[PDB]
Enzyme design. Sequence first.
Site, PDB file in Angstrom:
ATOM      1  CG  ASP A  26      -2.430  10.778   2.556  1.00 33.50           C
ATOM      2  OD1 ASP A  26      -3.130  10.014   1.858  1.00 33.50           O
ATOM      3  OD2 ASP A  26      -2.880  11.347   3.577  1.00 33.50           O
ATOM      4  CD1 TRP A  63      -4.474   4.769   5.344  1.00 31.68           C
ATOM      5  CD2 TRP A  63      -5.204   3.727   7.189  1.00 31.68           C
ATOM      6  NE1 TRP A  63      -4.362   5.649   6.393  1.00 31.68           N
ATOM      7  CE2 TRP A  63      -4.808   5.041   7.536  1.00 31.68           C
ATOM      8  CE3 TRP A  63      -5.702   2.880   8.195  1.00 31.68           C
ATOM      9  CZ2 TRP A  63      -4.897   5.531   8.847  1.00 31.68           C
ATOM     10  CZ3 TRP A  63      -5.786   3.367   9.503  1.00 31.68           C
ATOM     11  CH2 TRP A  63      -5.384   4.680   9.814  1.00 31.68           C
ATOM     12  CD  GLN A 102       1.335   8.601   5.518  1.00 27.38           C
ATOM     13  OE1 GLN A 102       0.851   7.897   6.408  1.00 27.38           O
ATOM     14  NE2 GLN A 102       2.368   9.411   5.726  1.00 27.38           N
ATOM     15  CD1 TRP A 157      -1.164   2.439   2.009  1.00 29.05           C
ATOM     16  CD2 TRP A 157      -3.041   1.565   1.156  1.00 29.05           C
ATOM     17  NE1 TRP A 157      -2.133   3.409   2.056  1.00 29.05           N
ATOM     18  CE2 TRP A 157      -3.297   2.899   1.542  1.00 29.05           C
ATOM     19  CE3 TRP A 157      -4.080   0.813   0.591  1.00 29.05           C
ATOM     20  CZ2 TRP A 157      -4.553   3.495   1.392  1.00 29.05           C
ATOM     21  CZ3 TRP A 157      -5.329   1.410   0.439  1.00 29.05           C
ATOM     22  CH2 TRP A 157      -5.553   2.738   0.840  1.00 29.05           C
TER      23      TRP A 157
HETATM   24  C1  LIG Z   1       0.454  -4.249  10.980  1.00 30.03           C
HETATM   25  O1  LIG Z   1       1.468  -5.177  11.350  1.00 30.03           O
HETATM   26  C2  LIG Z   1       1.058  -6.383  11.991  1.00 30.03           C
HETATM   27  C3  LIG Z   1       2.293  -7.200  12.378  1.00 30.03           C
HETATM   28  O2  LIG Z   1       3.438  -6.699  11.716  1.00 30.03           O
HETATM   29  C4  LIG Z   1       0.081  -7.136  11.072  1.00 30.03           C
HETATM   30  O3  LIG Z   1      -0.253  -8.431  11.529  1.00 30.03           O
HETATM   31  C5  LIG Z   1      -1.151  -6.241  10.947  1.00 30.03           C
HETATM   32  O4  LIG Z   1      -2.223  -6.895  10.286  1.00 30.03           O
HETATM   33  C6  LIG Z   1      -0.667  -4.978  10.218  1.00 30.03           C
HETATM   34  N1  LIG Z   1      -1.755  -4.072   9.908  1.00 30.03           N
HETATM   35  C7  LIG Z   1      -2.119  -3.840   8.648  1.00 30.03           C
HETATM   36  C8  LIG Z   1      -1.380  -4.550   7.555  1.00 30.03           C
HETATM   37  O5  LIG Z   1      -3.031  -3.073   8.366  1.00 30.03           O
END
Ligand SMILES: *[C@@H]1O[C@H](CO)[C@@H](O)[C@H](O)[C@H]1NC(C)=O
Length: 524
Positions: free
Chosen positions: A27, A51, A43, A24
């Site tokens: 911005d 996101w 971003q 992803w």
């Molecule tokens: C952010 O990171 C965690 C672990 O690295 C992941 O499991 C989680 O789903 C992530 N959030 C997202 C990709 O939106």
Amino acid sequence: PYPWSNAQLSWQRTAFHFQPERSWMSDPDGPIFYKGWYHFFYQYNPDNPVWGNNTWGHTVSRDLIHWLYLPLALAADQWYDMQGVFSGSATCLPDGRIMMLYTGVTKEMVEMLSLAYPADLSDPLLVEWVKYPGNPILSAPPGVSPTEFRDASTGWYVSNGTWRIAIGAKYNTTGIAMVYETKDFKSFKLLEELLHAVPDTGLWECVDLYPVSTTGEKGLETSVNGPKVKHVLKASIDEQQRDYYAIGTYDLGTNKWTPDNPEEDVGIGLRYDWGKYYASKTFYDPKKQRRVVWAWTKELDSEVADREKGWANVQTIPRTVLLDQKTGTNVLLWPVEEVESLRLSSKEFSKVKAGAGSVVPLDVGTATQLDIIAEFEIDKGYNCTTSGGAAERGVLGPFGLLVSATENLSEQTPVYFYIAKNFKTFFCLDESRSSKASDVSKQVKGFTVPVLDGEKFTMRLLVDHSIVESFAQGGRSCITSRVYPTEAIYGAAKLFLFNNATGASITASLKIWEMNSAFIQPFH
Ligand SMILES: *[C@@H]1O[C@H](CO)[C@@H](O)[C@H](O)[C@H]1NC(C)=O
Ligand SMILES: *[C@@H]1O[C@H](CO)[C@@H](O[C@@H]2O[C@H](CO)[C@@H](O[C@@H]3O[C@H](CO[C@H]4O[C@H](CO)[C@@H](O)[C@H](O)[C@@H]4O)[C@@H](O)[C@H](O[C@H]4O[C@H](CO)[C@@H](O)[C@H](O)[C@@H]4O)[C@@H]3O[C@H]3OC[C@@H](O)[C@H](O)[C@H]3O)[C@H](O)[C@H]2NC(C)=O)[C@H](O[C@@H]2O[C@@H](C)[C@@H](O)[C@@H](O)[C@@H]2O)[C@H]1NC(C)=O
Ligand SMILES: *[C@@H]1O[C@H](CO)[C@@H](O[C@@H]2O[C@H](CO)[C@@H](O[C@@H]3O[C@H](CO)[C@@H](O)[C@H](O)[C@@H]3O)[C@H](O)[C@H]2NC(C)=O)[C@H](O)[C@H]1NC(C)=O
Ligand SMILES: *[C@@H]1O[C@H](CO)[C@@H](O[C@@H]2O[C@H](CO)[C@@H](O)[C@H](O)[C@H]2NC(C)=O)[C@H](O[C@@H]2O[C@@H](C)[C@@H](O)[C@@H](O)[C@@H]2O)[C@H]1NC(C)=O
């Protein structure tokens, strides 16, 4: 839920627009020009094509086109930004220093302002970034919610070493733009007077205040002010996910921005782009003396296909911002001249005739990477959004081009003019039959465009796989959209000239260029 193949999904990757290798991106963040390099931050979610475990991606180019990936610039690694490193802008001081303001979100969802700056100003590539030891530096004022306090702008100079920045927000349903004063970009004092406020807009994101020349054809440095200088005030309207701007004047003494036309104020008037176009930021390009605008285009397919393909969202080709000196009441947006360096070969179609209800095939070879310039003449209330698109036949429209089209029109993306009875000229893009897959956007986007005496109907189209960028009348009105054809991919993608008016035949002249890849790659 359409069963996408590997071949269909891989085709969606663009040849010459900026996007990371995977995942992803959204911005634009603190774009600058520094020591021969154009810097772009964005971003970035490192984990998944959604996101957003927000971090700042970083990339550089010589010519706003041939981008080279760099190491990640900012990470969510401190308590005050653990939930994400949100959007922000750069201010260049006169002593060579770059101050990067960004929003940091705590795990409590609280948003606060923080400072970052280059670890090493002698490095043109600006790889390593350091967070200011005294972060966070600013929290929400009483009026504003601490979970919705974001997006500081580039600063503009006042005097005695004082700079101003703009932070958009809201009071109730009133979109507002606060101004803070600083001398060092480490401490901020909130001014009593708002920059401006507009009722019934909702939250203002990424506010942008900048000068435009009323006589020159050049961009101006952000701190420029005077008698022949107008100011554009721009906000992203969160409730709409759309960018709006207005033309007016800004007074340094009063700290007030005033619209030239209050009926077209910020959030209730003009847009940079009438399609999918969000969180736009400008910066001053000192090499060619331009103001360049950045903005991302979100995916318009399902999240399932995003996950299946591994990535999401592209940046539009950066555009110049100038005041439309012919009308005086809008801006001109035009792709940066360096986009022309991608042009390979051209084919011309001189004075092609298209009668009422006709479809003229345009043999160009492959039609997935194109730059098209077309002029239209007519021989011898309407609203794009609520219309039936290219199927809604009128006396003097619709007519124009069909891009991303199959041989037999099973899939098609019209970009068209529609003249409606005083005469209003409409410029629209029709997504309704772009794809056989039901789980994508099937909207008709557009607006009126001003056409002045003597002017032909002209459109420029940038076609690049899953993204189409359209520009009417030299960029007085723009429409960016995403297309996801199931059949109109690779060799099968064709291009047509059409006229679906009931009582008008049109004559068109086209020059079509095949576009090269930008060869976006990691930095050596
Ligand atoms: C952010 O990171 C965690 C672990 O690295 C992941 O499991 C989680 O789903 C992530 N959030 C997202 C990709 O939106
Ligand atoms: C050409 O036609 C199109 C379509 O008819 C016009 O655009 C529409 O304009 C209306 C307002 O006139 C917008 O309605 C608003 O809808 C919000 C919710 O939107 C959600 O649902 C959509 C489905 O339709 C979906 O597409 C969106 O993604 C979204 O999820 C409401 O929240 C909003 O109400 C709130 O805001 C108002 C004022 O801002 C305020 O009263 C309150 O604070 C509310 O909380 C609003 O609801 C309104 O419509 C229904 C009425 O009964 C209410 O009284 C109204 O308040 C609509 O979203 C929009 N659709 C689009 C763009 O697809 C278009 O109008 C122009 O463009 C819009 C964006 C706007 O800037 C207008 O000022 C312009 O005139 C038409 N063009 C014209 C007339 O030139
Ligand atoms: C020029 O305008 C004509 C007249 O409107 C267009 O033909 C019409 O195309 C529409 C849309 O494809 C057809 O409508 C129907 O839509 C539903 C979707 O809900 C679809 O499932 C139906 O099969 C049907 O196609 C309509 O039949 C058709 N009308 C006529 C008289 O042919 C024409 O396509 C336009 N030319 C373009 C866009 O180049
Ligand atoms: C947003 O709307 C609020 C609710 O209508 C406003 O508060 C109301 O203000 C009235 C007149 O100023 C007052 O008689 C009401 O009691 C009050 N209502 C409530 C529920 O608080 C509010 O105005 C702000 O807050 C009030 C208390 C005053 O301090 C005003 O000067 C403020 O502007 C609106 N909020 C904002 C941030 O503008």
